[PDB]
N, CA and C of each residue as an Amber inpcrd file, in Angstrom:
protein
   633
   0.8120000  -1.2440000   0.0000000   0.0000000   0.0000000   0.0000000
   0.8300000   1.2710000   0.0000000   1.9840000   1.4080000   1.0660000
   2.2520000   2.5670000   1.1890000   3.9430000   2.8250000   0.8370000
   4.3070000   1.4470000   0.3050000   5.7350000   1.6610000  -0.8330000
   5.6010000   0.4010000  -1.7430000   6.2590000   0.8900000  -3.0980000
   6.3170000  -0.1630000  -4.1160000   6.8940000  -1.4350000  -3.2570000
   8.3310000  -1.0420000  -2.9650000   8.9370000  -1.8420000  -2.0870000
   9.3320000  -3.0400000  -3.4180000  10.9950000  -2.7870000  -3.9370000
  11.5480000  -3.5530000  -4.7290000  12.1170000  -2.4530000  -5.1710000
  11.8140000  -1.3040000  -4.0310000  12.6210000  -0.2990000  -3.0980000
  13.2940000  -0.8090000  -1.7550000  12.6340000  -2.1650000  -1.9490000
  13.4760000  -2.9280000  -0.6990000  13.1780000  -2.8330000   0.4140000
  11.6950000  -1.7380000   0.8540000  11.9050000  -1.2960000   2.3340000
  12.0290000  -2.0550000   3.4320000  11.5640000  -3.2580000   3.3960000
  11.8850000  -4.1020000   4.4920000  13.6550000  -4.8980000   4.7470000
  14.3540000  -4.9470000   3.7110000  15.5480000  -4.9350000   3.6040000
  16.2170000  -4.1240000   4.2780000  16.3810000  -2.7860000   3.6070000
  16.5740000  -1.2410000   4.1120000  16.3690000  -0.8030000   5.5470000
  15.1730000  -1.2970000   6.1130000  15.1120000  -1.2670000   7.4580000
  16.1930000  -1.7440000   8.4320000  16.0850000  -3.4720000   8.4020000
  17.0660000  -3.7760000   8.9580000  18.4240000  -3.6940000   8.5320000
  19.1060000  -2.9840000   7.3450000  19.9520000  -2.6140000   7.3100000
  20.4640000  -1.3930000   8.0120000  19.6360000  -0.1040000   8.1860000
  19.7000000   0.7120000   8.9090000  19.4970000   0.6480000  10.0210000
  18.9750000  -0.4140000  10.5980000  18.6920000  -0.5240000  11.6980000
  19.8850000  -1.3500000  12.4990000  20.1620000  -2.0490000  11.7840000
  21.9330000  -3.1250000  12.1650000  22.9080000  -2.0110000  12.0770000
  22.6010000  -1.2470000  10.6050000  24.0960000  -0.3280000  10.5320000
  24.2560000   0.6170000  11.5350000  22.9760000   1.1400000  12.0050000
  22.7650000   1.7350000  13.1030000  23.7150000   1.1650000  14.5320000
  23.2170000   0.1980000  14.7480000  24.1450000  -0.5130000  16.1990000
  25.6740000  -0.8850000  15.9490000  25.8470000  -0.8550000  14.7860000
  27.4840000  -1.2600000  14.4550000  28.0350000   0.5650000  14.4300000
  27.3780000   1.2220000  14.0500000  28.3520000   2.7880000  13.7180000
  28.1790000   3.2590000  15.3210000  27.6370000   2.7700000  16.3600000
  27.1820000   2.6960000  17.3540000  28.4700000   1.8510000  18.5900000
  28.4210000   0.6920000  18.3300000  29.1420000  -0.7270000  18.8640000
  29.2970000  -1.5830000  18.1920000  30.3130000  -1.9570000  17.8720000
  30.7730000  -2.4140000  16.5170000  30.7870000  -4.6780000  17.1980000
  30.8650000  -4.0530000  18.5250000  30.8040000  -5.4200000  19.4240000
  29.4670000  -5.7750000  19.6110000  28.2340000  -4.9790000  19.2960000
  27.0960000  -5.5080000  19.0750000  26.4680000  -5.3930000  17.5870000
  27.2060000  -4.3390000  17.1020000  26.4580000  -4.2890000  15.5360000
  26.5900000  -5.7840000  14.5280000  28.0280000  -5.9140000  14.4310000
  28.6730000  -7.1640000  14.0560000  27.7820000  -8.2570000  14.0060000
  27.5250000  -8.5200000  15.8180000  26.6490000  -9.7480000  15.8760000
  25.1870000  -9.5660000  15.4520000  24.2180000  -8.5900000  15.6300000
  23.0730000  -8.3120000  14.7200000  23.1050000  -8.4710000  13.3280000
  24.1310000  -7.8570000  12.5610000  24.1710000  -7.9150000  11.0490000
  23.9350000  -9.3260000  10.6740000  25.3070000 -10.3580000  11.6750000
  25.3530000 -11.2400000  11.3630000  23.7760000 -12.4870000  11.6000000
  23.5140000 -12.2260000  12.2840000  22.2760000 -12.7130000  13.0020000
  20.7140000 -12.5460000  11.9360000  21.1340000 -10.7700000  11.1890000
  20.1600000 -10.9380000  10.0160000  20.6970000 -11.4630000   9.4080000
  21.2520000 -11.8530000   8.5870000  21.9920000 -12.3730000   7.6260000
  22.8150000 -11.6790000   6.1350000  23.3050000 -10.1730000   7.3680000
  23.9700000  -9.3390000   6.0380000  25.5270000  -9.8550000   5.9200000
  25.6920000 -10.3970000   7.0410000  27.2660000 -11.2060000   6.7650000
  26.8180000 -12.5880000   7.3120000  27.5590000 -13.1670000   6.1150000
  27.2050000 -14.4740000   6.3000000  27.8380000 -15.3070000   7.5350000
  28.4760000 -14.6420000   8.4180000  29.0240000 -15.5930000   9.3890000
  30.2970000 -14.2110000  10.1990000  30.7360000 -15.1880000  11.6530000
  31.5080000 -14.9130000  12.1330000  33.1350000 -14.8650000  12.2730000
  32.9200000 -15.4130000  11.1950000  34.5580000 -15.7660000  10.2730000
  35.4150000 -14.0380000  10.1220000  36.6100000 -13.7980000  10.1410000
  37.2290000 -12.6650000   9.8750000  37.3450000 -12.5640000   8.3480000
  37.3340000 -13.8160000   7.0960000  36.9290000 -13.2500000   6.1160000
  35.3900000 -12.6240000   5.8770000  34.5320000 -12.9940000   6.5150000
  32.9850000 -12.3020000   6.0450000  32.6960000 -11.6750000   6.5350000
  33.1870000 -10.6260000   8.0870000  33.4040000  -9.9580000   8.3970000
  33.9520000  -8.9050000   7.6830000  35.5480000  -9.3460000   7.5820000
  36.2590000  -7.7070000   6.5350000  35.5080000  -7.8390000   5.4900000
  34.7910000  -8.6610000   4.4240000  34.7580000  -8.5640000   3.1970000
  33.4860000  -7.1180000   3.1860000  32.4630000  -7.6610000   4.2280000
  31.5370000  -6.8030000   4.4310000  31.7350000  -5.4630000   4.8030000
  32.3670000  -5.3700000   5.8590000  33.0970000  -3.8930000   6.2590000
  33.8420000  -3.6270000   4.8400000  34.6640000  -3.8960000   3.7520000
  35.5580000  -3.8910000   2.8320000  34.4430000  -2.9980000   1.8170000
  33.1130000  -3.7530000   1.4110000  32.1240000  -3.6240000   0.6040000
  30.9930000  -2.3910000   1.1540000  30.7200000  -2.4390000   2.0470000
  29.8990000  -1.3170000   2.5740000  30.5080000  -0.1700000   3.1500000
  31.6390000   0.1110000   2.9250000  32.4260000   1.5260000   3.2580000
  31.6430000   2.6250000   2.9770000  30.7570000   2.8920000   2.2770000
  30.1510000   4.2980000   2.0140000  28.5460000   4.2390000   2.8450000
  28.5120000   2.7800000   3.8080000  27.1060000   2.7100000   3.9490000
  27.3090000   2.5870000   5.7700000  28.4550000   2.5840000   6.2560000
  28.8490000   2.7200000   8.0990000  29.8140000   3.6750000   8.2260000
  29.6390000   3.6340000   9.3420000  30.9240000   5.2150000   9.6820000
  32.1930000   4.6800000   9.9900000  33.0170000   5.5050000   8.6490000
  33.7950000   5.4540000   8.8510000  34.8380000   5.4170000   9.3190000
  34.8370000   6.3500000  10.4830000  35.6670000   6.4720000  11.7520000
  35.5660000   5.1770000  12.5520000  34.2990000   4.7570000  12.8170000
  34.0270000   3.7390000  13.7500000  34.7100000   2.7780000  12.9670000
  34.5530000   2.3870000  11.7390000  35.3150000   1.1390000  11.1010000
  36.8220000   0.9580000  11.1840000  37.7660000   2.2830000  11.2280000
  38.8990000   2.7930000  11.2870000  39.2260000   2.3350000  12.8890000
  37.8910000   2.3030000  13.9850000  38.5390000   2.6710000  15.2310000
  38.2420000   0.8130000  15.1190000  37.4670000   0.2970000  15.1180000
  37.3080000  -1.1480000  15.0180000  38.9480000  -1.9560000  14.3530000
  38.9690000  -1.5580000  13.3240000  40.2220000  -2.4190000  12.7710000
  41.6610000  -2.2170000  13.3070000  41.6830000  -0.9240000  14.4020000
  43.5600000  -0.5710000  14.8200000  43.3050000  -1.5890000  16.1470000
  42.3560000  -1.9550000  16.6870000  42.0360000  -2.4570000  17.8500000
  43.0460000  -3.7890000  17.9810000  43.7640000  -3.6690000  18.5210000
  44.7520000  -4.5950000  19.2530000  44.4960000  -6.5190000  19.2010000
  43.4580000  -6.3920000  19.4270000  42.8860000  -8.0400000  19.4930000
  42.3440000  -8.0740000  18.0760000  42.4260000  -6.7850000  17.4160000
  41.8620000  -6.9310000  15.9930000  42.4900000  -7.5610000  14.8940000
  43.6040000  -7.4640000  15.0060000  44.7020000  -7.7260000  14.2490000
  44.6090000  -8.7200000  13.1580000  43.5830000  -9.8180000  13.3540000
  42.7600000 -11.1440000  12.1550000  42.2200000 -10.3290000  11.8680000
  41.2600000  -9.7080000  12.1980000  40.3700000  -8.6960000  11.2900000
  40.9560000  -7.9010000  10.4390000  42.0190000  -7.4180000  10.7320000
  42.7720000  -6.1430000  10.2310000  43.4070000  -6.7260000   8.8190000
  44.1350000  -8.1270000   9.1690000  45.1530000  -8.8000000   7.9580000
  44.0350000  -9.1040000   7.1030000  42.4800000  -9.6800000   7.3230000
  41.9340000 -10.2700000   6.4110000  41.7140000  -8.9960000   5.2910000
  41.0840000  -7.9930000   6.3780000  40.7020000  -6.9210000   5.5000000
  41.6300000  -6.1970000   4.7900000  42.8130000  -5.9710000   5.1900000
  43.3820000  -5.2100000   4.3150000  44.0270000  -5.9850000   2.7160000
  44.1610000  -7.2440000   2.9720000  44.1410000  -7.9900000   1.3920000
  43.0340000  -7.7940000   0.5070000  41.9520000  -7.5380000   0.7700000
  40.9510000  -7.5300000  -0.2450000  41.0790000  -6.3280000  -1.3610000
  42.6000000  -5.2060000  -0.4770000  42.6740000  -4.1320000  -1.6480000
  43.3230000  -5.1450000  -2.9900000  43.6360000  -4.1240000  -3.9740000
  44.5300000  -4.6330000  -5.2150000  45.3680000  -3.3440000  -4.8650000
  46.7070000  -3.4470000  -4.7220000  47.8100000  -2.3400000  -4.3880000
  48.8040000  -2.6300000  -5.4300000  48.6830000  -4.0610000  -6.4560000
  49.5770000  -4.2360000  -7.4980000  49.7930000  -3.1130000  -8.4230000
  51.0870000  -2.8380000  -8.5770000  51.1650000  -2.3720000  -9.7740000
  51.2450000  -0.6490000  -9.6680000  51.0520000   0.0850000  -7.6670000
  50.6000000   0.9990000  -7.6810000  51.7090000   1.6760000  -6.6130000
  52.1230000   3.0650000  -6.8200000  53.2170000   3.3730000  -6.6400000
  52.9990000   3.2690000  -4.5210000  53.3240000   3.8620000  -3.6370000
  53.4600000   3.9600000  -1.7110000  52.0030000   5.0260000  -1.8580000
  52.0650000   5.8280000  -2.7050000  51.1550000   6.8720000  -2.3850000
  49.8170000   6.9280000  -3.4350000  49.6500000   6.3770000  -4.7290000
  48.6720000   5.6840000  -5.3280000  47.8820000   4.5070000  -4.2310000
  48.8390000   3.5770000  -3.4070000  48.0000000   3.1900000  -3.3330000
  47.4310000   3.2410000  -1.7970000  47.9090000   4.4400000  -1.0270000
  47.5690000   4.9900000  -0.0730000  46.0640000   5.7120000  -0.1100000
  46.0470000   6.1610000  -0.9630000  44.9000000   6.9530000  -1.7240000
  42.9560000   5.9690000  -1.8920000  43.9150000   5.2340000  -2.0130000
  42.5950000   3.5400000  -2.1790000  42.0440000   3.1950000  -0.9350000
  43.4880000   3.1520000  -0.3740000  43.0790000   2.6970000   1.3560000
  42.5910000   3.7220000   1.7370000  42.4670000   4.9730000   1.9170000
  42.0880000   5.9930000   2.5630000  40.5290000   6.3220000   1.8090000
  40.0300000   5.4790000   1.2570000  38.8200000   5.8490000   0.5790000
  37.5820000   4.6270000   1.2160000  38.2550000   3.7090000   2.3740000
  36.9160000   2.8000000   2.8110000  37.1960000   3.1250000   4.3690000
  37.9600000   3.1640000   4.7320000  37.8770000   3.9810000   6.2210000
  38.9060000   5.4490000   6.4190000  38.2850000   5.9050000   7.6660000
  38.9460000   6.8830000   8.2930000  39.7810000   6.5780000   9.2680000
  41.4160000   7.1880000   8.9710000  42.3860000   6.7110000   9.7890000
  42.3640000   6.9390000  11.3350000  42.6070000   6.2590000  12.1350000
  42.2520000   6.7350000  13.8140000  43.5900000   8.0010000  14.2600000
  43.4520000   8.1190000  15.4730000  43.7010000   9.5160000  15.7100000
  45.3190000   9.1110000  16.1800000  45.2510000   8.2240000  17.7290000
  45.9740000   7.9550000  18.1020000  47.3180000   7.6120000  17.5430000
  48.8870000   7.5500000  17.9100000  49.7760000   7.0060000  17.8630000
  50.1940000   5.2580000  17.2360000  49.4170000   4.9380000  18.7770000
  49.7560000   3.2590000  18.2830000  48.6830000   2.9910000  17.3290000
  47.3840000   3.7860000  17.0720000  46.0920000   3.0010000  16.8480000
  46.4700000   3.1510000  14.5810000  47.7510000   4.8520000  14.4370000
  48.1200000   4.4550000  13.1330000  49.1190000   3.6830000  12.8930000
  49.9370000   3.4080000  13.7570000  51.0540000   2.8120000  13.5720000
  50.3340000   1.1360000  12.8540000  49.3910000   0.2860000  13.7920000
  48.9970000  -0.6690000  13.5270000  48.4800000  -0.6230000  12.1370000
  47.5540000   0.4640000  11.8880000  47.0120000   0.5590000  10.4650000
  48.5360000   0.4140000   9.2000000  49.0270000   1.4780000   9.6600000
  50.1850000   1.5820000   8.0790000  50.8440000   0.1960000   8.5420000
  51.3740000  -0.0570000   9.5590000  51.8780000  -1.5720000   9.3610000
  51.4780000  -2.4590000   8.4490000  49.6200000  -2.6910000   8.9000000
  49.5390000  -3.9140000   7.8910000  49.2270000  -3.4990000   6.4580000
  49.3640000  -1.8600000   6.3410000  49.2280000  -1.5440000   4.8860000
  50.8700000  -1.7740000   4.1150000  51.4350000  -1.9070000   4.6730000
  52.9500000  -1.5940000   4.3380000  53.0360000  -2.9750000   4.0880000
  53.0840000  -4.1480000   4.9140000  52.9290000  -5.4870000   4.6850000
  52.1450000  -6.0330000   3.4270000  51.3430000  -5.5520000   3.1390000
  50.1510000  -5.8520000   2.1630000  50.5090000  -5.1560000   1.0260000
  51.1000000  -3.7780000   0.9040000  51.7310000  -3.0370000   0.1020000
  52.9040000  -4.3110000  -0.6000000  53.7030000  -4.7480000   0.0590000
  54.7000000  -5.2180000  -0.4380000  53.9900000  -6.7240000  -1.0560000
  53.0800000  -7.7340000  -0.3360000  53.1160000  -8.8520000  -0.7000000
  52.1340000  -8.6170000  -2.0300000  51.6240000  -7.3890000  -2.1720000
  51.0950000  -7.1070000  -3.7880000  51.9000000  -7.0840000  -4.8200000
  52.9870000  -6.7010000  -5.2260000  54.1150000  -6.5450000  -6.2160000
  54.9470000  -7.5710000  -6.1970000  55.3260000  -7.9400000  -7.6310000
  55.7220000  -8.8650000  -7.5670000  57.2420000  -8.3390000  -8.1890000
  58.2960000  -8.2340000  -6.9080000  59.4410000  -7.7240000  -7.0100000
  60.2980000  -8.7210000  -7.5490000  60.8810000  -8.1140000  -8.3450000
  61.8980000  -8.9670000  -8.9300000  63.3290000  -8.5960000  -9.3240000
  63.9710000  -8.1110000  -8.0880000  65.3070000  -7.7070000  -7.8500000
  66.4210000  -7.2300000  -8.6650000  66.1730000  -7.9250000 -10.0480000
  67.1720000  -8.0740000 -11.2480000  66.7510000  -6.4190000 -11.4870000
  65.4700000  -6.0800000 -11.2280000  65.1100000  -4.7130000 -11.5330000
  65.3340000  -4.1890000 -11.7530000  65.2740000  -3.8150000 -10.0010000
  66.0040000  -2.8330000  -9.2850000  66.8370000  -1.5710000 -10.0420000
  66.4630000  -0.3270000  -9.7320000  67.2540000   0.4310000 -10.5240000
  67.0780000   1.8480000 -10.0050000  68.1880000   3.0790000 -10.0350000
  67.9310000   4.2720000  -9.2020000  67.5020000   5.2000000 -10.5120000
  67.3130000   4.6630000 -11.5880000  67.0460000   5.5780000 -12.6890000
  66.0250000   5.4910000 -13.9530000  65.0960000   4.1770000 -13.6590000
  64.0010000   3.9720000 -14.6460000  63.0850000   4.4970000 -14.1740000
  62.9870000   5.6400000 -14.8440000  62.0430000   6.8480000 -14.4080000
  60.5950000   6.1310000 -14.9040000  59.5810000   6.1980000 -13.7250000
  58.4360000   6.1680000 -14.2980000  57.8390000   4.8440000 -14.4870000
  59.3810000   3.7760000 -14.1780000  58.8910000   2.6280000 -14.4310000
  58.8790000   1.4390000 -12.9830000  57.1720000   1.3190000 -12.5020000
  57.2200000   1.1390000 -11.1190000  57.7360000  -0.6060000 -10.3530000
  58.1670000  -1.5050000 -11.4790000  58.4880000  -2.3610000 -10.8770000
  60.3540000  -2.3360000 -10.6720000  60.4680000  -1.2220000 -10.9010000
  62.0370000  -1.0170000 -10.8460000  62.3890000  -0.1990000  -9.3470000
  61.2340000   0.2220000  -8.3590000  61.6470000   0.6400000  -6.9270000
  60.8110000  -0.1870000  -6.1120000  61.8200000  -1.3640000  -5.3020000
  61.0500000  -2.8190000  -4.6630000  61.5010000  -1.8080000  -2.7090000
  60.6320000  -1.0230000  -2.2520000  60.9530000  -0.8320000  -0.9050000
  60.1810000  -2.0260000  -0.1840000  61.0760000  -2.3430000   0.6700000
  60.7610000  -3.4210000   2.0100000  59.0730000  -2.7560000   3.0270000
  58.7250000  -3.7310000   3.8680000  57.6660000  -3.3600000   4.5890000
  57.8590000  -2.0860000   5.4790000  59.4660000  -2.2150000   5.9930000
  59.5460000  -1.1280000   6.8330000  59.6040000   0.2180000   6.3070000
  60.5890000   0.1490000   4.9480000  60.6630000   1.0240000   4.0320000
  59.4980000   2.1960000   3.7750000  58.1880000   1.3150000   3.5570000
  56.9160000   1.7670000   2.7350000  56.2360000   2.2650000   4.1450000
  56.4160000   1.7980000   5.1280000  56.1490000   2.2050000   6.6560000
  56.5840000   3.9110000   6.6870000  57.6640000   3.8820000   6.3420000
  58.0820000   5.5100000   6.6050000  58.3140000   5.7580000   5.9380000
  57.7890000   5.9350000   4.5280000  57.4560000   6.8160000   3.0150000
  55.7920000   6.8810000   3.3420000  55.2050000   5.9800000   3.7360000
  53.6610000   6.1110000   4.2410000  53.2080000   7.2770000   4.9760000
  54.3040000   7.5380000   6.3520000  53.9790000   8.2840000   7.2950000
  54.6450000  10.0690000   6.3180000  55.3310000   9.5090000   5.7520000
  56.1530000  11.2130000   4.8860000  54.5430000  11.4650000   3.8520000
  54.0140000  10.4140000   3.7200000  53.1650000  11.0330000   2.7380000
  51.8530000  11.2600000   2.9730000  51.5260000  10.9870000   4.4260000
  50.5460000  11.8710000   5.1810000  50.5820000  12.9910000   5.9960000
  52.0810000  13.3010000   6.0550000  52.5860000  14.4450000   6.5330000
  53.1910000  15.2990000   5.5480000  53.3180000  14.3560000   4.3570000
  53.2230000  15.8360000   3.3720000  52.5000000  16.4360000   2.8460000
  50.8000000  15.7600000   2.5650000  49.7860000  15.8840000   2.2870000
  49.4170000  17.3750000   3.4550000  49.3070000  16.9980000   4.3000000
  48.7890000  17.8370000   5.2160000  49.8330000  19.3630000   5.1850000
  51.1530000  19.0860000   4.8650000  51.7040000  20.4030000   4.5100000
  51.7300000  21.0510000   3.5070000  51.2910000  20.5350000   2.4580000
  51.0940000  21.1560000   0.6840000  49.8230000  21.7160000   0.7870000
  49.0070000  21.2960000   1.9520000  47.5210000  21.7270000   1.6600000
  46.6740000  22.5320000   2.8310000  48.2210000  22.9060000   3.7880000
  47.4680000  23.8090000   4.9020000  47.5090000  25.2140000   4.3400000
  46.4800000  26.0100000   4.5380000  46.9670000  27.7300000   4.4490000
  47.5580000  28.0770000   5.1690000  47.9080000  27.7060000   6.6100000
  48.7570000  27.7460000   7.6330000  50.0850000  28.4620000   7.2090000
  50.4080000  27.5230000   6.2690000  52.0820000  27.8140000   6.4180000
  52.8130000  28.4760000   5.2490000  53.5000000  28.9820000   5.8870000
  53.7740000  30.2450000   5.4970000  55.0320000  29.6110000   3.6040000
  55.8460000  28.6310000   4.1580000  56.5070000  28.1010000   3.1020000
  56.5240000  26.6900000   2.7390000  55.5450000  26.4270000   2.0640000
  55.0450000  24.8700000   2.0480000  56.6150000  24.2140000   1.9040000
  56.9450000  22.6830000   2.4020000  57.9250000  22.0680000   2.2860000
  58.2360000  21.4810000   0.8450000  59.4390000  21.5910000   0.2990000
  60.1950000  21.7450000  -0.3260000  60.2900000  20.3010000  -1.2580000
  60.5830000  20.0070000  -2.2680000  60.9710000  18.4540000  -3.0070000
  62.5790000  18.2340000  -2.3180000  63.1770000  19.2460000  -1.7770000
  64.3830000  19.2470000  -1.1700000  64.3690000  18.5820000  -0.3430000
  63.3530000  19.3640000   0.7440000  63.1840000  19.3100000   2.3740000
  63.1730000  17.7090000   2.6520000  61.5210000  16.9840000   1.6450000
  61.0010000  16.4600000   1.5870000  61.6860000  15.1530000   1.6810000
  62.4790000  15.0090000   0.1320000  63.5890000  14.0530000  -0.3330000
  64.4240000  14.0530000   0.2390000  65.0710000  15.2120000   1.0140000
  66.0960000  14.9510000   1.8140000  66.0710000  14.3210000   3.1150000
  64.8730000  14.3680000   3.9280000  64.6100000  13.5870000   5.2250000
  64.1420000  12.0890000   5.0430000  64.1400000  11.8350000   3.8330000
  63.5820000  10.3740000   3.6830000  65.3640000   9.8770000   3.0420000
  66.5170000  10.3060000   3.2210000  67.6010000   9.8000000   2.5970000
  67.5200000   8.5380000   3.4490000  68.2790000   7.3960000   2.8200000
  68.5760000   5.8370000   3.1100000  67.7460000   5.2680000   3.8750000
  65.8180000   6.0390000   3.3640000  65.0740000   5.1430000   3.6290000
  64.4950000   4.4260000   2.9680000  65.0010000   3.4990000   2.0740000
  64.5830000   2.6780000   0.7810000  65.9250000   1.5150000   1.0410000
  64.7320000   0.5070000   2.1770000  65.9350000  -0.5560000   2.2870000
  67.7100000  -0.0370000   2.9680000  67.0780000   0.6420000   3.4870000
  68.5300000   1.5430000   3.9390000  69.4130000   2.3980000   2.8010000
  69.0750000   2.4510000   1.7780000  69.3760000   3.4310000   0.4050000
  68.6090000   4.6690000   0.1280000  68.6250000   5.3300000  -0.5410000
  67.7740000   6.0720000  -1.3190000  67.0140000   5.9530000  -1.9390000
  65.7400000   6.2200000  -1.9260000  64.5090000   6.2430000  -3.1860000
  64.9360000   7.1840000  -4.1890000  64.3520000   6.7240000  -5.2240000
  64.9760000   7.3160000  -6.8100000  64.5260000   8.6290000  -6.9750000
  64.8330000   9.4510000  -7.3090000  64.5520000  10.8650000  -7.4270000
  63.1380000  10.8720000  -8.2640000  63.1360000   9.8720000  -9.2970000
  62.0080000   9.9440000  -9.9970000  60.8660000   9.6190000  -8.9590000
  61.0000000   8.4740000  -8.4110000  59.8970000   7.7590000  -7.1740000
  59.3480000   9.3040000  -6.3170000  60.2720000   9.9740000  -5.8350000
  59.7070000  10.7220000  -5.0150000  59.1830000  12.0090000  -5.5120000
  59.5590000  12.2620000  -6.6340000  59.5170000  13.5290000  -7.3600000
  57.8130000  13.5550000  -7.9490000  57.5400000  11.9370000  -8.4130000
  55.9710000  11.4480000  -9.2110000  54.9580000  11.7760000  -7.3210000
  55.5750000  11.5720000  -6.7500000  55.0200000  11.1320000  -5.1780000
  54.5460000  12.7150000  -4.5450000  55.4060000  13.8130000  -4.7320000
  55.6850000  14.6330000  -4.2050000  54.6160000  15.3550000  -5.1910000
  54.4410000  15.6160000  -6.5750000  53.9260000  16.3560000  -7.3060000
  52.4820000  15.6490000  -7.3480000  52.2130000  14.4970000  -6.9300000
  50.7570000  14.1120000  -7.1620000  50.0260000  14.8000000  -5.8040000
  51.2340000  14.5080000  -4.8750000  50.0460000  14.8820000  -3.8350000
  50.0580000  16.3500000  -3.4670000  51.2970000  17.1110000  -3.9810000
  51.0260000  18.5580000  -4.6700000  49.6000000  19.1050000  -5.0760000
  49.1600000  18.4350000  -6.1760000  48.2650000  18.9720000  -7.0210000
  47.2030000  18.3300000  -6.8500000  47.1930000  16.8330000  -6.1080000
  45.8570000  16.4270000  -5.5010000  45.6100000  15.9820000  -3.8680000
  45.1070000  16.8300000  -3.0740000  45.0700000  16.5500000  -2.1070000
  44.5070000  15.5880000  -1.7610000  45.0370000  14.2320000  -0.5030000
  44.6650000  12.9620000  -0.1340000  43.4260000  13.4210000   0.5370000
  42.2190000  12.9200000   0.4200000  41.1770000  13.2390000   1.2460000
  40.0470000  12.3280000   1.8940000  39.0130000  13.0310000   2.8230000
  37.5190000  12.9330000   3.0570000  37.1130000  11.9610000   4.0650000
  36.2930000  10.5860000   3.5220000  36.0770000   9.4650000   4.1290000
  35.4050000  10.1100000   5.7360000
């Protein structure tokens, strides 16, 4: 009578009504969703896949504060494989990740996040050493940085983001400044002038955002 409904409304309900208690308590939303049957189970793959897939439909923050969580850590590894990071430069594919949750505030709570992005970063590419090279500009299977490596080019490139794009400051930081504080952090070497230069000018001209 009072909806077509194939508008779904009875669907829709308890979706809002579950998504509701999870953007809420993520320790009771979880088990409701699961209980209707929007995730098929209590498993840490059908868990992340769902959180992975409905990013634009729970809050984000709350999903961000759910996955740094300490005992989370199965949750955290399942979910963060479901990106594709092949093929995509520290800060391309920073950009991906930063588009299904919002990063948490705390210290340890990012450290845990870029960890298992940095981990996951690396077991995407398929490095192949013979590469390796400080001068194939442009060409991305030729700069193979380690987990720790991509760990602190990760953290330079949310702290450079935030300095290219404050009005704050008075002399935005430099391709100098920039490149020069990240020296012999590439495997204990240098990243290629080209690597940081593509890195430095993207997030120049496009600021990392939103979520």
């Amino acid at each position: 009578g009072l909806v077509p409904r194939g508008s779904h409304m009875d669907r829709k309900t308890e979706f809002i009504e579950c998504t509701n208690a999870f953007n809420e308590k993520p320790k009771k939303g979880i088990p409701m969703l699961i209980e209707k049957g929007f995730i098929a189970s209590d498993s840490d793959k059908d868990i992340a896949e769902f959180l992975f897939n409905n990013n634009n439909r729970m809050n984000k923050k709350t999903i961000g504060l759910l996955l740094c969580h300490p005992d989370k850590v199965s949750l955290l590894n399942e979910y963060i494989r479901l990106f594709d990071f092949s093929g995509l430069r520290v800060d391309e594919a920073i950009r991906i990740l930063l588009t299904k949750f919002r990063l948490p505030g705390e210290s340890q709570q990012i450290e845990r996040i870029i960890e298992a992005f940095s981990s996951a970063y690396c077991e995407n590419q398929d490095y192949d050493p013979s590469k390796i090279s400080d001068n194939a500009e442009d060409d991305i299977s030729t700069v193979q940085p380690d987990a720790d490596s991509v760990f602190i080019l990760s953290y330079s490139i949310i702290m450079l983001n935030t300095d290219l794009h404050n009005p704050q400051v008075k002399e935005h930081m430099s391709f100098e400044d920039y490149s020069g504080n990240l020296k012999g952090c590439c495997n204990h070497k240098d990243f290629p002038f080209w690597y940081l230069d593509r890195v430095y000018c993207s997030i120049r001209d496009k600021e990392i955002v939103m979520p």
